[PDB]
Amino acid sequence: EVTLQESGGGLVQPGGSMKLSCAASGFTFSDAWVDWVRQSPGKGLEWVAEIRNKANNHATKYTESVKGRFTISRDDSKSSVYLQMNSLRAEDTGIYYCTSVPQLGRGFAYWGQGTLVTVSAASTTPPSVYPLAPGSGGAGSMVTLGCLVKGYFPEPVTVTWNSGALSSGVHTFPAVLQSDLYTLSSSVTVPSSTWPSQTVTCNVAHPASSTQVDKKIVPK
């Protein structure tokens, strides 16, 4: 069972510091060369840094724009690699992924899930959650309900319906940012024979602020 798991991301002050961690398991970490790759709009995927294995003197290589500011290191006894980031700039914002080359010529075979790093002086703010219910009466065969999640910062929030029991007719849209901070909407379409007879609830979690809200969709 192979996996890489990143942790340590989130909101950070421009000019500040942050350390990302990557824990490995399921493969021979001590033989692997480990890399960090980031993704942002405009650059797309961008290689960031690499640290080799002990046999190769733990040598490190960095992309030009982070040399002197970032430091990659590894602890083979904990099967982990770290990325220490200093003097963070707005341009360092993006999703950071841990990936590894387990053996010669294998390429970046395993990737972590990614961790979002937002470099900004704005502050963490919880979301307000509003149920969106139809106006008129259903019918006709299907009904669309929604959930408006607004005023939060930074990303991301996770939205589920009925704690995950409802997923097929669900669309969660990318968040939009403006002066009221982030605004995100999610819709779910269910049979008219399901709502309002049965309870339909929007569950929202905002990790950055430790906020959790469950709002029921009621007929207006």
Partner: protein
């Protein structure tokens, strides 16, 4: 730096047929050891990249048999023997010869399907938002195809452009449709000065605008 080029930003394909995606490098990727260091990755919407093919033509473990790769020196091709609806995503090539390692800009695979009109739903501000002094009017335009759509907001017959927030989903991996969300941001006071709110959509599936509206005073 070695420059990786994937000219096509996207490629439309119908499920069941074969197709290929190309990638070019500004320098030969042949190493002294005899291996060619070009890999292909797939990034499905909202997920991390995943290795498909390493060193031109070796399929990684778990990768479907329908994928194959070919090429040499500076020109490479990723081929699908039969495309599936679930293959939606962005395909990237990467050179692993010299530092810094560089990726192509990616080619998005677009699945072609039958036209599908959007299901349009408009939602008046929830009462919980009005007591808080806000009044966002939300319009969902769901499960349509092709991807291009235009939305217009009208307040008492007059069009409104400012304070509109637009968001789009990627192509659905099961039904191949697209969806969009448009939100008209108003304050409670603004919301109460008017009565008619309409979400008007223009799509290829209709010669006339798709209209959905409601009246505040109801």
């Amino acid at each position: 730096d070695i420059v990786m080029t994937q000219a096509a930003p996207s490629v439309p394909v119908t499920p069941g047929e074969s197709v290929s995606i190309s990638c070019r490098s500004s320098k030969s990727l042949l190493h002294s050891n005899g291996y060619t260091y070009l890999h292909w990755f797939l990034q499905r919407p909202g997920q991390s990249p995943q290795l498909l093919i390493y060193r031109v033509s070796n399929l990684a473990s778990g990768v479907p048999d329908r994928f194959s790769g070919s090429g040499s020196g500076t020109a490479f091709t990723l081929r699908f023997s039969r495309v599936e609806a679930e293959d939606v995503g962005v395909y990237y090539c990467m050179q692993h010869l010299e530092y810094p390692f560089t990726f192509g800009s990616g080619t998005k695979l677009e699945i072609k399907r039958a036209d599908a009109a959007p299901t349009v739903s408009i939602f008046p501000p929830s009462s919980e938002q009005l007591t808080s002094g806000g009044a966002s009017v939300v319009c969902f335009l769901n499960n349509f195809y092709p991807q291009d759509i235009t939305v217009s907001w009208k307040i008492d017959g007059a069009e409104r452009s400012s304070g509109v927030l637009n968001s789009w989903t990627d192509q659905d991996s099961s039904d191949s449709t697209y969806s969009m969300s448009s939100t008209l941001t108003l304050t409670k006071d603004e919301y109460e000065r008017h009565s008619s709110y309409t979400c008007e959509a223009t799509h290829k599936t209709s010669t006339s605008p798709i209209t959905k509206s409601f009246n505040r005073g109801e």
